[PDB]
């Protein structure tokens, strides 16, 4: 997973 | 065992302000993404906010931005809705939920996902 | 202004498999989940990143993704399966994206 970040950019 | 309990809300008058608060347990909070979903009487569901875990970043539906904000405690496990400028089409029931948001190389691709709900809040906005 | 495209409702007989379909251009690359929200209650997710089952969800309820519709299947339809369907996905114009929600009726 993303580790929790909504949006990556 | 998972848990999210949601509290606040209730009436409130066209033009003023109402807060929800959401409050998490049996999971490790400092990893995952927070949301608030809302669903008007006899509607379907609608995404409203998020808040990631650790960097600050909030998102909003364009439905709401400018008068809701999403904000997070980490330090004390809790997930809130400052709800500004209530207008009749924010009456509706409000769901704070866990996301769940998937590993991509770059962006374009995304899989985000709620898997655990809080009970639902009703919100009225009436005079 | 993208848009996830759902039946208003969807009527099956017990014991037969009720199909609900999720439409939405270049569906392929976008990953669905669906949730089941019976009357009074949370929703509940069903299926997530296409066809993935959650621990909880019994095995008759699966999902699926082939071109443009996603689709999701209930093995056996009984009484207690009359809800409201969502499916979900993700688009840069609109961020998290249901579906209009599918009422499911049982034929008795």
């Known amino acids: 997973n993303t580790n929790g970040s909504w949006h990556i950019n | 065992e998972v848990q999210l309990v949601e509290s606040g809300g209730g009436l409130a008058q066209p033009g003023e302000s109402l807060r929800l608060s959401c409050a998490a347990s049996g999971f490790n909070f400092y990893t995952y993404a927070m949301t608030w979903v809302r669903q008007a009487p006899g509607k379907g569901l609608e995404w409203v906010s998020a808040?990631?875990?650790?960097?600050?970043?909030?998102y909003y539906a364009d439905s709401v931005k400018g008068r809701f904000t999403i904000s997070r405690d980490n330090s004390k496990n809790i997930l809130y809705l400052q709800m500004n400028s209530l207008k009749a089409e924010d009456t509706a029931t409000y769901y704070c939920?866990?996301?769940?948001?998937?590993?991509?190389?770059?962006?374009?691709?995304?899989?985000?996902?709620?898997?655990?709900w809080s009970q639902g809040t009703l919100v009225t906005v009436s005079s | 202004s993208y848009e996830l495209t759902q039946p208003p409702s969807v009527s099956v007989s017990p014991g037969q498999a009720a199909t609900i379909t999720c439409s939405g251009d270049?569906?392929?690359?976008?990953?669905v989940s669906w949730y089941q929200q019976r009357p009074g209650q949370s929703p509940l997710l069903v299926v997530y990143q296409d066809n993935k089952r959650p621990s909880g969800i019994p095995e008759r309820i699966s999902g699926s993704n082939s071109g443009n519709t996603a689709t999701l299947t209930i093995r056996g339809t009984r009484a207690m399966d009359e809800a409201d369907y969502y499916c979900?996905?993700?688009?840069?114009?609109?961020?998290?994206?249901f579906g209009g929600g599918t009422k499911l009726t049982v034929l008795r």
């Open positions: 808040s990631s875990s650790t960097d600050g970043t909030t």
């Open positions: 270049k569906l392929g690359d976008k990953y």
């Open positions: 979900q996905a993700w688009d840069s114009s609109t961020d998290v994206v």
């Open positions: 939920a866990r996301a769940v948001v998937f590993t991509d190389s770059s962006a374009y691709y995304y899989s985000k996902y709620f898997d655990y």
